[PDB]
Design a protein around this nucleic acid. Structure first.
Lengths: 63, 53, 65, 66
DNA sequence: GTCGCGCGCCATAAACC
DNA sequence: ACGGTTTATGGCGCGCG
């Protein structure tokens, strides 16, 4: 929920309909993709984030 | 719709009758929900459950 | 080699009906890790189609043209 | 079942207070990770091994319980 | 009768930079 | 005498009869 917050913050910042990727997040936060992804996927089951299947997947805030 | 009802309503095996749902499906929404911080798993055999206030 | 086995096995099942990687793992006498490894490789090669689920169901790839 | 014996042996031959992952046991023992974990988890219930929390879990020969 | 399991995941090939 | 490092649905925690 700290790093969940780093990520959520960043998404909300970066546009209001925008998406992004684990690789993008990882750069803009000096964090291994593994970590970013650990949290992105957690957040998704929690209903918080919305994921668009793809190579790589695209992540945006949900309702 | 399950997540919703699961809330309004103990064991998963015991949840299969009250809502008429296969145990698999209940254990799914349980472990998920406790991962959402809302529920909380007790160590029984089988495991027991209760809404974390 | 293991691929054409799975395919061959997905022929003798009647068009429409699908199967799981556990099921295959038994029938074909092969560890599930290898089965799935190959299954996911055939779907991506086009030969097969994956119907994501719990567990996922696998059948011959169906043209959508 | 000489799998238990082989793993306990490997975890002993690794050193004092030292741990390792099941992926690693499967590698060296040349044994499917499926069986390795089935067994690892088994030895932990029997009390012989302890499972350190992690991703993945780390294992080592127990040192506390009776 | 615990069990939620979706798992292929690299003893990797290809792709990036 | 030389392409090192990251990706992939790569998140994996899995042991399940």
């Amino acid at each position: 929920s700290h790093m969940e917050q780093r990520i959520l913050k960043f998404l909300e910042e970066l546009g209001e309909g925008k998406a992004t990727t684990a690789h993008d997040l990882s750069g803009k936060l000096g964090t291994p993709k593994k970590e970013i992804n650990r949290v992105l996927y957690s957040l998704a089951k929690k209903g918080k984030l919305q994921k668009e299947a793809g190579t790589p997947p695209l992540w945006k805030i949900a309702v």
